[PDB]
Amino acid sequence: MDQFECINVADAHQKLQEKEAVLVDIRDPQSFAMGHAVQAFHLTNDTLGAFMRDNDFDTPVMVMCYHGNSSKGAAQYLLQQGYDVVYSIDGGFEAWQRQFPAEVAYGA
Numbered sequence: 573m574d575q576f577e578c579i580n581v582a583d584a585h586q587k588l589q590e591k592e593a594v595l596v597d598i599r600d601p602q603s604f605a606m607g608h609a610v611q612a613f614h615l616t617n618d619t620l621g622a623f624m625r626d627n628d629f630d631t632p633v634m635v636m637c638y639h640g641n642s643s644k645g646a647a648q649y650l651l652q653q654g655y656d657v658v659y660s661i662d663g664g665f666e667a668w669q670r671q672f673p674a675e676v677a678y679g680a
């Protein structure tokens with residue numbers, strides 16, 4: 573569709589466990605290596621090209637950032653590129669680590 577939706581980390585974790593959506597983390601590389609959701613793909617300007625060749629526009633994509641704010645602009649951007657199903661995770665990594673502390677990974 574032509575709008576994205578904001579979802580909470582419990583909802584995102586369920587879509588992930590169900591293999592219904594992919595998770596992309598748009599934080600800087602240092603922040604990403606210091607700890608990120610298991611299974612998140614590090615999506616930056618430099619990795620965008622690859623991401624799009626690898627994930628069709630019909631793939632639900634959930635976007636995670638620092639606190640749930642920048643993921644909005646990034647989600648809208650992905651819609652503009654042709655992605656139809658895009659979400660922004662309210663609370664960002666902070667909420668994810670709080671709710672699912674055992675599901676954090678380190679490094680790239």
Ligand code: NA
Nearest residue numbers: 638639641642
């Ligand atoms: Na943010």
